[PDB]
């Protein structure tokens, strides 16, 4: 549970001194691009149900063993729980790119859900591939311009793909 | 080990240990603490390594557990997990010794002749050590995973 600003504050307090000037110029540029970070976050957020349905749509086209009887996502209840797990992961990705820090995504999902999927018998590979495909579709949905003033979103595609790869690797 | 190899390599040459070999032995002597930490990491969690690696192996190569394969049945699968336990033990020995002469000098010389006399596919054994390497390097930090994966890498390389 950290912001960008609280991250700089905690680092400056662990140093024990005041915040240096270059960190303040970095935070000024962050305050200039923080809206830039988040209009996209808004265009990521508005299409979330389409994102998770298309992600499960491609995943269960890709691995039909999960839909097959005896598969892990075969049962209707389990399949609803699977879509719930995916939607939760997407929501915490949107939270982490809202606050601009991966510590919220770590705190809320990562440390426990790997052991949860081991204990449940859930294959971590399929949900890892699903989070990867969902992240690819999310950047693909975010990057296109349909009536928005053009801007360079290069570091925020960088950051969003970082968050999605962190989620997919912590899932394993 | 490192000291055995340096002593023998200076021993054939009828010379003492060169100073470069001596700081090699010194650096291995200093890194022995991290080697012992990797060895405790590999030793304490051997149950989960052998179990998960056998599970991923039989998922990956199901024909050796199907009727017709070598490791078909209860006792044959138990002997298969025992052979994987042997190779993880040799991995721990090679991690401590700092060189692969325990692993090679115990369980890699006539491995092709033995597994041909038993009727075993050696590629499936290489896949077993590959899954053991995946579970083991999924269990450690970065440099620890690299240092253990060097010896796992040597075992899979000495298979094929």
């Amino acid at each position: 549970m950290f912001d960008i600003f609280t991250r700089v504050v905690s680092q400056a307090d662990a140093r024990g001194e005041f915040i240096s000037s270059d960190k303040l110029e970095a935070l000024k540029k962050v305050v200039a691009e923080g809206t830039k970070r988040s209009d996209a976050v808004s265009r990521m957020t508005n299409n979330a149900s389409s994102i998770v349905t298309n992600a499960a749509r491609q995943l269960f086209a890709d691995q039909p063993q999960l839909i097959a009887p005896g598969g892990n996502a075969y049962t209707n209840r389990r399949m609803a729980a699977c879509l719930r797990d995916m939607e939760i992961i997407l929501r915490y990705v949107t939270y982490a790119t809202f606050t601009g820090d991966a510590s919220v995504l770590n705190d809320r999902c990562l440390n426990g859900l790997r052991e949860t999927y081991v204990a449940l018998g859930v294959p971590g590979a399929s949900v890892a591939a699903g989070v990867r495909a969902m992240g690819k579709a999310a950047v693909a949905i975010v990057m296109d311009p349909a009536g928005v003033t053009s801007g360079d979103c290069s570091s925020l595609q960088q950051e969003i793909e970082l968050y999605f790869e962190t989620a997919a690797k912590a899932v394993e | 080990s490192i000291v055995t190899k340096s002593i023998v390599n200076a021993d054939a040459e009828a010379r003492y240990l060169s100073p470069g070999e001596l700081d090699r032995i010194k650096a291995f002597v200093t890194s022995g603490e991290s080697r012992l930490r990797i060895a405790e990491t590999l030793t304490g969690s051997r149950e989960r390594i052998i179990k998960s690696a056998g599970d991923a192996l039989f998922q990956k190569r199901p024909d050796v557990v199907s009727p017709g394969g070598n490791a078909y049945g209860e006792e044959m699968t138990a002997t298969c997990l025992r052979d994987m336990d042997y190779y993880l033990r040799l991995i721990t020995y090679g991690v401590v010794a700092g060189d692969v002469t325990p692993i090679e000098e115990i369980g890699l010389v006539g491995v092709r002749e033995m597994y041909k006399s038993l009727g075993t596919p050696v590629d499936a054994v290489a896949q077993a050590v590959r899954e053991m390497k995946a579970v083991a390097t999924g269990m450690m930090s970065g440099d620890d995973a690299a240092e253990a994966g060097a010896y796992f890498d040597y075992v899979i390389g000495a298979m094929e």
């Binding site: 209840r77 052991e115 | 039989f58």
Partner: protein, 228 residues
């Protein structure tokens, strides 16, 4: 009365929404709202006793708390508090266990969920000694989770213990978490000598498996699944 240090919540079955209809392995719910009989009140009282401290002896039972409960003056969460601050529960649970172990046990029983991490039990363990067990029980009962899942007159229970269409759910907190820890066991000197077993535990030394034999790994070879 400094605030608790913040702690991570780990992933658990309670954390998700969950999509379950009324199944068997869903635990039975006991509210005072749907029960009015002398009978039904006795059944509810025994259910609360079972949940708070596995078995309740006749001396263990509190005539005051049950007697107040049948009128309606006392709500079932106040009955839970009366069981928690009861002296026999303190004696069986708080005195024998360690402080962190006690916080773990009581969080399991009252909230119905396992503690998220050791850091959460460490965070909660300070309230006990700084303010007394009564103030800790007061701080534990009025949280968001207890008020959201049970409330005023629902007997607490283990939440989403067993999953839908599963053979084995989870271990019940009653059998899983005993009354005292291993330290109090060491205080009793409790590992007892049993010679009458070692007659029947004795197998011939030829039959005992050794380090070259594959009979040690046979349990793993029969516990692992092999696809057809």
């Amino acid at each position: 009365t400094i605030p608790l240090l913040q702690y991570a919540p780990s992933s658990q079955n309670t954390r998700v929404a969950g999509y379950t209809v009324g199944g068997d392995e869903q635990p039975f719910v006991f509210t005072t709202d749907n029960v009015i009989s002398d009978s039904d009140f006795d059944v509810l009282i025994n259910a609360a006793y079972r949940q708070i401290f596995f078995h309740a002896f006749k001396c263990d039972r509190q005539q005051l708390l049950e007697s107040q409960l049948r009128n309606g003056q006392i709500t079932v969460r106040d009955f839970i508090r009366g069981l928690l601050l009861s002296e026999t529960f303190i004696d069986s649970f708080y005195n024998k266990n360690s402080n962190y172990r006690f916080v773990e046990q009581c969080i399991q029983r009252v909230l119905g969920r396992d503690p998220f991490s050791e850091q959460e039990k460490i965070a909660w363990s300070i309230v006990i000694c700084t303010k007394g067990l009564a103030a800790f029980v007061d701080q534990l009962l009025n949280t968001d989770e207890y008020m959201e899942n049970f409330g005023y007159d629902t007997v607490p229970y283990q939440r989403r213990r067993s999953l839908a269409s599963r053979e084995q759910g989870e271990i019940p907190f009653n059998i899983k978490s005993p009354r005292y820890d291993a330290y109090y066991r060491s205080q009793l000197g409790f590992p007892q000598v049993v010679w009458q077993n070692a007659v029947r535990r004795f197998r011939t030394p030829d039959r005992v498996p050794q380090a070259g034999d594959p009979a040690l790994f046979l349990n793993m070879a029969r516990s692992a699944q092999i696809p057809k």
